Amino acid sequence: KTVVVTTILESPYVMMKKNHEMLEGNERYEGYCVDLAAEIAKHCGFKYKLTIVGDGKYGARDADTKIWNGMVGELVYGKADIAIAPLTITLVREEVIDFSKPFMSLGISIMIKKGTPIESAEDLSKQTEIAYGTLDSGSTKEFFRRSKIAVFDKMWTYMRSAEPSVFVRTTAEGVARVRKSKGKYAYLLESTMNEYIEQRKPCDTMKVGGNLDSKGYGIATPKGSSLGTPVNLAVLKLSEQGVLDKLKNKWWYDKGECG
Numbered sequence: 003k004t005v006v007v008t009t010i011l012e013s014p015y016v017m018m019k020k021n022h023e024m025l026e027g028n029e030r031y032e033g034y035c036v037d038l039a040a041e042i043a044k045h046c047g048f049k050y051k052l053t054i055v056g057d058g059k060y061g062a063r064d065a066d067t068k069i070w071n072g073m074v075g076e077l078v079y080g081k082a083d084i085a086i087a088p089l090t091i092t093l094v095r096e097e098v099i100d101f102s103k104p105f106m107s108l109g110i111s112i113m114i115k116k117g118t119p120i121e122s123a124e125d126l127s128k129q130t131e132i133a134y135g136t137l138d139s140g141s142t143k144e145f146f147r148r149s150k151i152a153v154f155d156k157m158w159t160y161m162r163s164a165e166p167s168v169f170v171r172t173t174a175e176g177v178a179r180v181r182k183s184k185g186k187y188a189y190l191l192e193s194t195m196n197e198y199i200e201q202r203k204p205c206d207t208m209k210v211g212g213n214l215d216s217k218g219y220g221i222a223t224p225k226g227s228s229l230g231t232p233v234n235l236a237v238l239k240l241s242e243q244g245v246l247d248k249l250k251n252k253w254w255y256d257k258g259e260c261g
């Protein structure tokens with residue numbers, strides 16, 4: 003059968019090709035996870051169709067109805083066979099879907115407009131002049147909402163009460179907000195995205211400080227799927243053959259624009 007892959011528009015993992023109007027099917031998209039999908043499919047021996055998740059969400063569970071949205075929802079309710087995306091491995095997700103060993107490491111990080119007098123989360127937490135926010139749904143938001151760490155708790159308590167809202171609906175919105183706010187907004191986002199943006203014109207943002215946590219993205223399958231095992235073996239093989247490194251370099255650094 004043709005494997006249905008759910009994924010999400012997020013640079014440089016999955017992007018629309020420049021002439022995507024005149025192209026169709028999987029050929030409409032480019033990026034790290036596009037390449038990774040091709041590799042995994044080659045190693046597991048399956049045909050596949052790339053589909054952009056309907057609600058443009060990563061995956062969150064409603065506290066009241068217990069219903070999952072986003073890519074995770076697509077997996078749990080039988081809409082997709084596999085998610086190949088920068089989907090963070092988390093405990094609550096692992097309880098309802100299966101993850102491969104991780105294919106890329108990351109941690110929550112801080113993005114500033116160059117010139118901003120901020121070097122750490124503690125720095126942010128100690129002041130109010132510079133606003134700061136996260137993506138409105140996903141593992142970063144959850145990290146802050148659930149954290150028992152003093153500094154991070156202080157930051158969450160600030161963020162959920164800030165007027166107007168400091169949360170954004172896409173990474174693009176967060177980056178744009180950094181660039182337009184003349185140093186008065188800092189954006190908390192996954193280090194991988196931060197590092198990508200740092201390598202792109204107009205070269206006016208930077209990652210500062212260490213990461214706030216350490217985790218990974220994994221390939222996800224519906225719980226108890228037969229695809230789970232071969233997909234995991236493929237991730238291991240791609241890791242050991244240096245393919246994951248080659249792809250990371252390909253999409254992040256090989257054509258860097260900021261030196």
Ligand SMILES: CC(C)S(=O)(=O)NC[C@H](C)c1ccc(-c2ccc([C@@H](C)CNS(=O)(=O)C(C)C)cc2)cc1
Binds near residue numbers: 106108219
């Ligand atoms: C959710 C967490 C439990 S976690 O993210 O899974 N682990 C946390 C821990 C600090 C950690 C975080 C990230 C990494 C890490 C290390 C390597 C990789 C890639 C490059 C290869 N993954 S692999 O499994 O080692 C490989 C042999 C295929 C991806 C993630 C390893 C350990």
Ligand SMILES: N[C@@H](Cn1cc(F)c(=O)[nH]c1=O)C(=O)O
Binds near residue numbers: 061090139141173195
């Ligand atoms: N990977 C996350 C989604 N996600 C993406 C980002 F770019 C980010 O900065 N924060 C975040 O939670 C998830 O799987 O929920």
